[PDB]
Amino acid sequence: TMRAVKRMINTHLEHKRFALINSGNTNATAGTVQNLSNGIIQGDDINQRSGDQVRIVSHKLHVRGTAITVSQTFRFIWFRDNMNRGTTPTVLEVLNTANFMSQYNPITLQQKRFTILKDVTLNCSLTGESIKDRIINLPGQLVNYNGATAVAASNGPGAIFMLQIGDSLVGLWDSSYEAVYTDA
Amino acid sequence: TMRAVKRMINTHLEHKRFALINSGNTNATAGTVQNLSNGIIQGDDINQRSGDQVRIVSHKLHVRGTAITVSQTFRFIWFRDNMNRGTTPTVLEVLNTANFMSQYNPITLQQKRFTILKDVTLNCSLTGESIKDRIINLPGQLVNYNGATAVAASNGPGAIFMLQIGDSLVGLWDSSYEAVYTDA
Amino acid sequence: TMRAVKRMINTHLEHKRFALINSGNTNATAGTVQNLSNGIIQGDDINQRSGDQVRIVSHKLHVRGTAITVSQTFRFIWFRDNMNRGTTPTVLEVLNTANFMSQYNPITLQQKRFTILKDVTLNCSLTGESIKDRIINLPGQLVNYNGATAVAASNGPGAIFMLQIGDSLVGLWDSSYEAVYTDA
Amino acid sequence: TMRAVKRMINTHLEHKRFALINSGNTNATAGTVQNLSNGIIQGDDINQRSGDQVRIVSHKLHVRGTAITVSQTFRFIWFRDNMNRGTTPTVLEVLNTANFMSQYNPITLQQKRFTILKDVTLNCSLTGESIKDRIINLPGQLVNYNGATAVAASNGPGAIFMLQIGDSLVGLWDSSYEAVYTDA
Amino acid sequence: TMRAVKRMINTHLEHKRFALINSGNTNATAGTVQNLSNGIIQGDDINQRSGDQVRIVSHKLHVRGTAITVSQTFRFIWFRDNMNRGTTPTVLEVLNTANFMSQYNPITLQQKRFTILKDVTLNCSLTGESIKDRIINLPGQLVNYNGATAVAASNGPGAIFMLQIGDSLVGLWDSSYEAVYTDA
Amino acid sequence: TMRAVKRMINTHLEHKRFALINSGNTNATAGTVQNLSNGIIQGDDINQRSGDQVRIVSHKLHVRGTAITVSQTFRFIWFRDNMNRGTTPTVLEVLNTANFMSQYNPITLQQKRFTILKDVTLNCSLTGESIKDRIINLPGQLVNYNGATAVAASNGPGAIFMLQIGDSLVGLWDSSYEAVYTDA
Amino acid sequence: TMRAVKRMINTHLEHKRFALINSGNTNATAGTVQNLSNGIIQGDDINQRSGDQVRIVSHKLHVRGTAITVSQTFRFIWFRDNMNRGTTPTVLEVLNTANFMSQYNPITLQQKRFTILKDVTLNCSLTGESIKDRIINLPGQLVNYNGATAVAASNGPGAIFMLQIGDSLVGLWDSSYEAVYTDA
Amino acid sequence: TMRAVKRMINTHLEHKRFALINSGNTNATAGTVQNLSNGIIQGDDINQRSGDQVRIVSHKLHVRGTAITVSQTFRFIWFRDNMNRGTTPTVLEVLNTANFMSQYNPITLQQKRFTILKDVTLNCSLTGESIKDRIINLPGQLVNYNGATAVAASNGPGAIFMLQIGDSLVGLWDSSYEAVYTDA
Amino acid sequence: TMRAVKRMINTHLEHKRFALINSGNTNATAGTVQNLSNGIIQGDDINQRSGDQVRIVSHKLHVRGTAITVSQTFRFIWFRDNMNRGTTPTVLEVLNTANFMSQYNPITLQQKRFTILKDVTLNCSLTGESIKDRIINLPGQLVNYNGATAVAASNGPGAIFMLQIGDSLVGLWDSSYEAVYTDA
Amino acid sequence: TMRAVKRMINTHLEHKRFALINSGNTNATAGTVQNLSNGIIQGDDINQRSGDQVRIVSHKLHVRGTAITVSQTFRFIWFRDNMNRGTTPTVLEVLNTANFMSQYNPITLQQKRFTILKDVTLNCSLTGESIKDRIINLPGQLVNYNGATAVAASNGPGAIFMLQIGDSLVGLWDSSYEAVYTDA
Ligand SMILES: [Ca+2]
Ligand SMILES: [Ca+2]
Ligand SMILES: [Ca+2]
Ligand SMILES: [Ca+2]
Ligand SMILES: [Ca+2]
Ligand SMILES: [Ca+2]
Ligand SMILES: [Ca+2]
Ligand SMILES: [Ca+2]
Ligand SMILES: [Ca+2]
Ligand SMILES: [Ca+2]
Ligand SMILES: [Ca+2]
Ligand SMILES: [Ca+2]
Ligand SMILES: [Ca+2]
Ligand SMILES: [Ca+2]
Ligand SMILES: [Ca+2]
Ligand SMILES: [Ca+2]
């Protein structure tokens, strides 16, 4: 009866929580990669961790894009880095070319360096809907860390990131993230 | 045969009703929390109660947002306060930070101070759809009161509220609420 | 399945509550009869009632006696008046003679005018334990009223009382009572 | 086989322990409320915690009362605050009136703000037994915290307290508490 | 057990990948036909092939249209050429007439020269949403080649193409394609 | 085994095809009725017929509307004339009144003169989406003819038509139709 | 049949006995720890042992307290030292603080250094019962020794002790102990 | 199904790790006792612990001996101290006499003060193999601590040690240790 | 019948082979990491590959150490890098410290960056056996590449390496490797 | 159920222990016979006995030989004397001739005077391994004694001995022995 047991277990483990907000960023045509699970540092508080492992039960991502000056596109790629050794992946590691219309890098998705969680494209128009947002909630996995503080070198296999790329540099995007995890 | 019995029971209890309307309010970037079930005061009429308990069979919420001057966002968070002791919760009790893009306060949602019923975001554009609305109908629960009148001190565990937060202070939002409850 | 049904029913009915305290009374050798359920008057609050009936789910009685000047006895008789027509029963109605060592009145207990809930005797000594108390919790019954206010004429069949009789007039006794009842 | 599994689980979790002693206090006729589980602060020691949750497997309370000058009563009410938001409850929240003979506050026990664990009354006589004590051991529950330090604002839903009220201000009472909890 | 076996087989074959991007093209009222699987040339790299056959496990197509000067329509027809002998099909081979509102050529779809994978129409408005895109993912088939290089003469039966036709010549469209295939 | 047999039968019958396009028409407030299956004339080619009967296996209709000068509505009613005797039905035969908001003619739909296949309404706005289209694919039926050429007198029971009615005379609509039929 | 066999076995082993009395001791506010099983030394008599092991079948403890000058408390903690290496445990090893109202030392009871057999508190009053006693009989266990004589260094794992702590230094306590053990 | 459950449990607990190296030590004819699990101190890192308990899933020991000047013997005794109270055991506690050829101390192994994990003897010859090593991997147990830092007083029941004794004082030995443990 | 099928499959795939020899290397006290599967470059020969994936059916490693000047130790650690992104791992990534007696790096083996295939230690003595060797044969896995040539940047997840570390810099070690793999 | 019973029995009997060490002895070409179980004399301590019988549960023997001046052989014969009448057997009683290469005495092994437990030969070389040792652990038997002290006349049937014979008189051998026995 493996379904039940898994809950008697989880009602004994504390479900710590971590929140993070990243507002008023500009659209990048070359893209940028943001850290989301790196903020969970070693400490004894509710949004911290013990050791170098944590289990995200569920995490939620909220992306918003606002068109300014011109009508543009905003792309948000939520992904898990399965073989991270203490860095923030670059855009050319995930994307074939540093373009918002590009497919994934064939070599890195063949060896499964990354696991694409969600790929969202928002088209903000200055003659229609100039503001668009989207919320995504997903079950989580194991996250390994290589350090105790909130630096790139602390990222480990299972690290959660978000790639942002567009076709303009003038529009603004906002984001928020939340992770519920056990730390037993 | 617990399904049947529950209806023979409910066809004997009077299903009292309460309506409330809250129009022409301005968008708040810091947010505000409105009372919805507090209006049900002690009396012997159809939209009143006897004692300090009532059972909401079903309640409906209607939110509308209108963009003025600028294109903006309107966020409506319908929630139940499970451990209310005679107050109107503040925005920082529900939200991590007083921002419309923010995730929930990790400490208060861990202990389940609140139960989020519905989280609706409406993006009103002055170049597209400047008026948006939304109706939500949900089964209810038990509502406890700590007083007989329509004051904050009368709110109790199970109290129903609505948090409104946006990114402008110039847009207008309207709301209406209805609750069908037994009072046996 | 009459056990279950009885609970689906009771989780729908509001369990109103009434508290009452009666401190610093003197021991009576002739006795006195105190009112306990009479305090529940018509109103729309948590310790009031609708109509002339209520159902006590459970009630608790707390009696305390303190010896002063001499060592004495305190007798507390908690009882239900099953055929009350708007009065406070007298001591000779319950007791055969107005004495603290007396048995019950044979005629009134034969026709079951009363139902003795609890008969407690406390012997307070000024050379031993001069202070004694006792708490008793019991399931309740139906209580009928003949009026809407807290007067003797409002007492009805099922009315709850307490008879106090001792062998001195100098000792002090305290009491408190609580009743949990439905009013559907 | 849910009985077994629950033990294979618990033989893997560390059973941390916390002790506390509160001696030579004076009887209060208005009462006082003492903190018992608040002492468990964030840290990495055996009587500390990680995060804002802990699970008390079992806790024990020891109360002692000594009569001085006069024969008096000592009341100890051990209770769990199920909807605590960062405070030390007051006496009028638990008791109907600030009296040692009083029943519970009808409104707060109807909504189950509190769960009374144990209600002990000790009558110390200066002509009999002037010293009385009592030990109570009970299974525990989940305790939520709202802070990391030992302040009232850190108390959360499941917080354990003790209310002391008497009929004199001259007698002395002592108390000790122990909690065994998991922190996985 | 033909389901299983098909996976033991595929976990032994290398899943090579090919990406391609085609940006800033102008809308054609006469239409144009673009090559998508022709880019997979003979070589020993991850986006190349051995022999003249490959098996596309899955391929994805991304089309975007932007209205410029006028509000217009963009039509994208993703199709497989089942009887290709070394050419890029013309528009009159797929469409009855060189018009964006036209049905398929009755003679060529009767003999099944082509297999229409997806037919997408995007209406870009300069007073509404001027930018629209669409992503389509589909299981693949066998692709035969007639040459080793990326020329039209190398296209073979199973060749994948995309027909673009609109009602203006001023709007811009972008596209990207990805194919995952075995080459055993 | 009537399912199978029906396919062994149909893989023996030639599935002839007919295409037709009708572009740049103006919106009519009184409406117009267009011919769709009348184009299939007697001949020995792929889009012709033998005899006066044909069986449409499936047909597809594509309607497009473009707002010009004013924001308007375009209504398209695809219908089968079951009792046609050699004419193009008028608008008052299908509609109760020659208005785009009107319900069907009660007398002709009671006797089932017509069978409404699809009723599509497109609202083109000059401040939003000014261009809208819609594709509908449906299984067909038997079509009888009363002549050999493409004239109204050749229409017979089962004839397929399209009624177009709007609230302006300035907007433009386009349409295309395709029919796959057997002619055994 | 493991129940029977265990008795055929024990009716073959000699049940040696040891008695000990410790009278007229004074109450200690810091406490003291007394030896109980240490008296069983190597020899060939009825209250001696062979080797460094013995099996206590059952042992009995008798504690008496007498109030002198003031009314006081006497605490007796009968315990087994499971990891003794040749010493008399100190009071701070068993108790958290050297106080008669204190809970057990959290660290030593977590690792199970000790096993509390019985914790008895006697309140002797000079106005009530000034003399109180208590007898406790319990099944025993294995006792290991590290020496042959009656010195602290001879105590081993399973050693039996008694901790005495009070709130006065003037009262007197007496004790007696008996152990029935096998020595096969 | 107790085998499975034990793994669903362990895939939720973080398996912290601790490494330690102790090189260039000289052979002791009287012997020395080294600490191995004492290094795991309270902290929130991967090689630290929370509370005073940990569960070693598996630990590995590596011993190396090098003969210098003369051919000699190196003895390594890996052992668990089951009744440790905050010390580093001495050699005479484990060995009968401080000699490398000696059997275990009869009194301490009878009461099971220690549990010998591994007893390895390496004979290094200067005319043969002068360098010898050995690796041993074993499942672990529960480890209790009495302090938070890396001092002898922090050692508790379950503490892991290594005794080194030889027949020369001139040879050199090296050692390394690793422990994988849960800390839930 | 998944056992059989797996062989019918493998008798169809060509089992390519790669050999490599690395002789006359000096012992390193800081260690070095050698490449073993990197030599398999893109080409169409028997010891080459197509694409960026290969499946090693079985590989064999041969290590030899020769003592020169002094008696020394040679350590060989054969390992698979599961999350390689185009580098040759360093010694501190695998080992806790750059010492031949050291345990593995706790952080990198917790996240399973590496999988230790074999850890061999050879003690070469100049007074005994100065030459020692060892052959190890093991089933293989999937190997991913990030490039087509024999450079560090071509290494991918599944890359096979060998770490060599000793206690002298004067001894010589030799090695050979062979891999049998499919490339379908 | 004779397996179980044998353990319920043995968990009641004290497992006394005896250790003995015999270092720095010279190799004998004529041989010598050493006493091992004779050391267990009558007394009441842990390494003594009661009566003239004991039951060895298990005993362990450790032999070491060191080559000096010349390379030599060391032979160790561990044996039980089943018919001992109060002596130390001579070498010619066990061996056919007083030579280290000799077979057993045919007459004494035919009547089973002795039971050979272990026959170990160690060849110590001064150009190879000059030091060799060996540990042997074996279940025991009944041992009878003929006296109370540690003299040869006290040896009885079941007496344990060790015969040492070599081919040189210059090498040194060491030995240690341990016996675990019951004495019920
Ligand atoms: Ca952790
Ligand atoms: Ca009510
Ligand atoms: Ca009523
Ligand atoms: Ca008295
Ligand atoms: Ca910490
Ligand atoms: Ca916790
Ligand atoms: Ca191929
Ligand atoms: Ca617009
Ligand atoms: Ca026909
Ligand atoms: Ca014994
Ligand atoms: Ca721990
Ligand atoms: Ca040699
Ligand atoms: Ca090639
Ligand atoms: Ca390949
Ligand atoms: Ca003796
Ligand atoms: Ca014996």
Side-chain angles (χ1 to χ4, degrees), chain F residues 49-55 182-184:
Chain F
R49 64 189 161 89
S50 178
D52 280 334
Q53 279 198 347
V54 320
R55 286 195 78 85
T182 58
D183 189 37

Side-chain angles (χ1 to χ4, degrees), chain D residues 5 8 11 14 16 44-45, chain H residues 6 42 44 50-52 55:
Chain D
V5 59
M8 184 162 182
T11 182
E14 168 165 3
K16 302 193 178 169
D44 328 303
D45 212 347
Chain H
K6 188 187 171 183
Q42 282 183 11
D44 328 303
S50 178
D52 280 334
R55 286 195 78 85

